[PDB]
Amino acid sequence: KSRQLKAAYSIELAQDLRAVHGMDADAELSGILATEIMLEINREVVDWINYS
């Protein structure tokens, strides 16, 4: 079964983050979304353990 996430962040947000704290605001999201998938799976497994 599949699992996917989309961010599609704005231009202005990224420009602001670069201006505010030197951030790129793309990679950060890449990180967050990938992170969210790994963690979500981790939970799915744990929850299935309790489920069964």
Binding site: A27, S30, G31, A34, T35, M38
Partner: protein, 492 residues
């Protein structure tokens, strides 16, 4: 604990036990000097369970990989520049000398050691240590990469089931993928000041399979803890203004290398921009919206399209047959007795150099690369450079002893105790250019003879032959006796 490092982990554990059993206590600063960056750990009295270490390595690796990444990429970019790569090339050429029917750095056991039997085995293994790197074919590049990147760390390869036979060649760890670190794990009153082990292991990424040149291609994942024992290494003793921010020799060029490139291009822009002629044709048109007023501009804009462009491959002018107009022919009509339209020419990039400012900088850069001033007999500058090369060789070549003691200990050629007392001095030694060595020696001899010549008339009056040999020819007492012996024999 990943199994690929099992025997190395055991080696580190043994070293740690010895540290734990020592008296190195009352330490106000952890006893580290250079290389690896430390980290304060949980120190549950002395404990750090592997699972505690796992986070510890993440928290050591994140805050600083970027710095390493920037420095290495910078050095590599510097390496691709005009007269920078050459500095390295000459340094590499002298640091790693390899010629026809010539040796490579080789173990030289000319000082007391356990036994000639062992000395011979050690030499044979040393040869394999280098054969494993194809040193005799690519040793110069292994060095070249190190010098440029400032640091080399290699993965040791094991079987490990039969680790006398199951001893394999090294794999250079990917620079920028591995962090050299230390961990302080132990607790005392008012800060920890007791037998810290420091660990001195490495932290490896999974991002090493890098693609997308000059990009930022990364993915989520775990990190690898690598035992000290598992890695062969050397690095330049160069650190930036603070911390353990290790830099390379090439770091020196970061400013001026770019300043020169920038200046070179600035000169070029100045010469090219404005090289073409320059002029604005003007037309003054009213009584119409610009959409239509502009038609009077078209009357010249679409008429004086002097597309007389020079061909880049052959120096001819596009579509200008016949071969040459002696003069251009232009004219403009005026609606009234008002000189309002015009051809406004512009000043160009006149010929003012004086390529002297850039000269200063290029020269400064050139020497700043840590190269002889003789590069574009024997002088202080050549000797100084040779000393530099000796230092680089001295520090770099530790990478051939690390795997040597490792392999010898595993095989049973040497014991740990023996290594520890034997070195001291288990040096290795390389070939140096014979062309110049001969010339150097010849000049030394010229002085030696010239002084004997000068001394000559007083040889039986104020001074002696023994002394002249000792002070003028700089011979040892033993050397003199042996030459005297040979000389007497030659007479018959």
């Amino acid at each position: 604990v990943l199994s690929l490092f099992a025997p190395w982990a055991k080696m580190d554990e043994r070293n740690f036990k010895d540290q734990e059993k020592e008296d190195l206590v009352s330490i106000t600063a952890p006893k580290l000097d250079d290389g690896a960056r430390e980290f304060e750990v949980s120190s549950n009295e002395a404990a750090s369970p592997y699972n505690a270490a796992f986070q510890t390595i993440f928290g050591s690796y994140e805050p600083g990989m970027k710095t390493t990444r920037e420095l290495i990429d910078t050095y590599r970019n510097l390496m691709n520049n005009y007269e920078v790569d050459n500095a390295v090339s000459e340094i590499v050429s002298d640091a790693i000398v390899y010629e026809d029917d010539t040796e490579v750095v080789a173990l030289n056991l000319d000082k007391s050691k356990f036994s000639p039997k062992i000395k011979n085995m050690m030499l044979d293994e040393f040869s394999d240590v280098l054969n494993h790197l194809s040193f005799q074919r690519k040793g110069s590049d292994h060095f070249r990469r190190w010098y440029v990147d400032s640091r080399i760390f290699f993965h040791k390869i094991i079987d490990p089931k039969r680790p006398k036979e199951g001893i394999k060649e090294l794999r250079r760890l990917d620079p920028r993928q591995v962090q050299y670190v230390r961990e302080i794990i132990t607790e005392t009153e008012a800060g920890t000041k007791i037998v810290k082990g420091y660990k001195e292991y490495f932290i490896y990424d999974t991002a090493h399979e890098s693609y997308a040149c000059d990009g930022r291609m990364y993915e989520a994942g775990t990190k690898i803890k690598i035992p000290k024992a598992a890695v062969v290494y050397a690095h330049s003793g160069l650190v930036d203004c603070c911390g353990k921010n290790i830099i390379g020799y090439l770091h020196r060029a970061v400013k001026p290398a770019n300043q020169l490139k920038l200046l070179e291009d600035a000169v070029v822009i100045y010469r090219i921009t404005r090289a073409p002629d320059r002029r604005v044709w003007y037309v003054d048109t009213g009584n119409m919206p610009a959409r239509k007023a502009a038609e009077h501009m078209q009357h010249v804009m679409n008429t004086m399209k002097n597309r007389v462009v020079y061909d880049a491959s052959t120096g001819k002018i596009k579509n200008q047959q016949h071969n040459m107009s002696m003069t251009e022919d232009y004219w403009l009509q005026r609606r009234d007795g008002k000189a309002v339209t015009e051809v406004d020419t512009l000043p160009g990039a006149d010929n003012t150099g004086n390529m002297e400012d850039i000269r200063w900088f290029r020269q400064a850069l050139y020497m700043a690369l840590r190269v002889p001033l003789s590069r574009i007999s024997i002088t202080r500058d050549e000797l100084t450079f040779a000393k530099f090369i000796r230092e680089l060789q001295h520090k770099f070549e530790e990478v051939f002893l690390d795997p040597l003691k490792t392999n010898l200990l595993l095989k049973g050629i040497i014991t740990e105790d023996e290594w520890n007392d034997e070195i001291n001095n288990i040096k290795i030694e390389f070939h140096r250019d014979s062309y110049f060595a001969e010339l150097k020696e010849a000049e030394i001899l010229e002085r030696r003879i010239n002084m004997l010549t000068m001394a000559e008339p007083f040889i039986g009056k104020y001074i002696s032959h023994r002394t002249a040999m000792k002070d003028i020819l700089q011979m040892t007492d033993e050397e003199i006796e042996q030459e005297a012996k040979q000389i007497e024999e030659e007479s018959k």
